[PDB]
Design an enzyme around this catalytic site. Structure first.
Site, mmCIF file in Angstrom:
data_model
loop_
_atom_site.group_PDB
_atom_site.id
_atom_site.type_symbol
_atom_site.label_atom_id
_atom_site.label_comp_id
_atom_site.label_asym_id
_atom_site.label_seq_id
_atom_site.Cartn_x
_atom_site.Cartn_y
_atom_site.Cartn_z
ATOM 1 N N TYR A 81 0.825 -1.217 0.000
ATOM 2 C CA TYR A 81 0.000 0.000 0.000
ATOM 3 C C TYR A 81 0.840 1.240 0.000
ATOM 4 C CZ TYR A 81 -4.681 2.070 0.835
ATOM 5 O OH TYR A 81 -5.914 2.719 0.748
ATOM 6 N N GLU A 178 -3.508 -1.911 -5.652
ATOM 7 C CA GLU A 178 -4.535 -2.950 -5.783
ATOM 8 C C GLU A 178 -4.276 -3.793 -7.021
ATOM 9 O OE1 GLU A 178 -6.257 -3.492 -3.159
ATOM 10 O OE2 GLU A 178 -6.999 -1.613 -2.322
#
Ligand SMILES: NC(=O)c1cccc2c1-c1ccccc1C2=O
Ligand SMILES: [Cl-]
Ligand SMILES: [Cl-]
Ligand SMILES: [Cl-]
Ligand SMILES: [Cl-]
Ligand SMILES: [Cl-]
Ligand SMILES: [Cl-]
Ligand SMILES: [Cl-]
Ligand SMILES: [Cl-]
Ligand SMILES: [Cl-]
Ligand SMILES: [Cl-]
Length: 268
Positions: A81, A178
């Site tokens: 992330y 993602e």
């Protein structure tokens, strides 16, 4: 001892982007995130945060665009992330959840003149609120990414509204973090690039994003792939369905966050 070492850098540009250049970029992200030595049900597991050497903790993604601007995102290898970014003389970080993570980010962008940690974290619930739109109404694709890069670039000089900054983070996180986490989401972005399309993610994408931590846990705690409890996802039309086994997810999920449980008590 381990000597300080520059973090790995991966580059992407929206200028002349193709399906191939994007695919090669996501391949590079996954490669720098993983060792290749921890793979469960054919799915790589990310490095464990506990005890991880600081040189191994982050990777950098340098983004350039048609405007000839550049920003650099930092990704946490333990969850893929975005933790912050640098542009010019300034770096900005999402609020860390704990003191260990706050210490880790002091090793990022250590040449910048100005460092700032936002009061807010980088979770979608918060970023959507700041952006004034949910993910379902934020378009993704090479066009959105182009403009997100410029927004990040100009933030320190007063060129970028807070909602625009938040929206730009939402775009970058989905198209990079993602996409690295899920071949399915990589594929969604590839299709957008192929057609020079901009479009918001459908419920199948959004639910995968929401469920990544739960899926990582379910897979790693599974009995020969069989989940101890089902995980609910959504189809493209929003209809709910349950997943009971890793098999259906092997072509879908590309990375998992490391999971472990401590031993049971061994004394009364
Ligand atoms: N609306 C934006 O994404 C935005 C915010 C701040 C600065 C910029 C932008 C933006 C959008 C499209 C082209 C150029 C730029 C420009 O550099
Ligand atoms: Cl260091
Ligand atoms: Cl182009
Ligand atoms: Cl810091
Ligand atoms: Cl750095
Ligand atoms: Cl927050
Ligand atoms: Cl969230
Ligand atoms: Cl909305
Ligand atoms: Cl847009
Ligand atoms: Cl749309
Ligand atoms: Cl299933």
């Amino acid at each position: 001892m381990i000597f300080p070492k520059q973090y790995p850098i991966i580059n992407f540009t929206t200028a002349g982007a193709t399906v191939q250049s994007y695919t090669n970029f996501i391949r590079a992200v996954r490669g720098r995130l993983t060792t290749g030595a921890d793979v469960r049900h054919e799915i790589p597991v990310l490095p464990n945060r506990v005890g991880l050497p600081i040189n191994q903790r982050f990777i950098l993604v340098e983004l350039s665009n048609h405007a000839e601007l550049s920003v650099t995102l930092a990704l946490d290898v333990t969850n893929a992330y975005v933790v912050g970014y640098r542009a010019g003389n300034s770096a900005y970080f999402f609020h860390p959840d704990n003191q260990e993570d706050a210490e880790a980010i002091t090793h990022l962008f250590t040449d910048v003149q100005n460092r700032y940690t936002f009061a807010f974290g980088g979770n979608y619930d918060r970023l959507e609120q700041l952006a004034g739109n949910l993910r379902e109404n934020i378009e993704l694709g090479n066009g959105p990414l182009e403009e997100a890069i410029s927004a990040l670039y100009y933030y320190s000089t007063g060129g970028t509204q807070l909602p625009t900054l938040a929206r730009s983070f939402i775009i970058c996180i989905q198209m990079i973090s993602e996409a690295a986490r899920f071949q399915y989401i990589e594929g969604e972005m590839r299709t957008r690039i192929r057609y020079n399309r901009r479009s918001a993610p459908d419920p199948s994408v959004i639910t995968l994003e929401n469920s990544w931590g739960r899926l990582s846990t379910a897979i790693q705690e599974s009995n020969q792939g069989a989940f101890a409890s089902p995980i609910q996802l959504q189809r493209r039309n929003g209809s709910k369905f349950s997943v009971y086994d890793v098999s259906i997810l092997i072509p879908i999920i590309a990375l998992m966050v490391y999971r472990c449980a401590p031993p049971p008590s061994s004394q009364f």
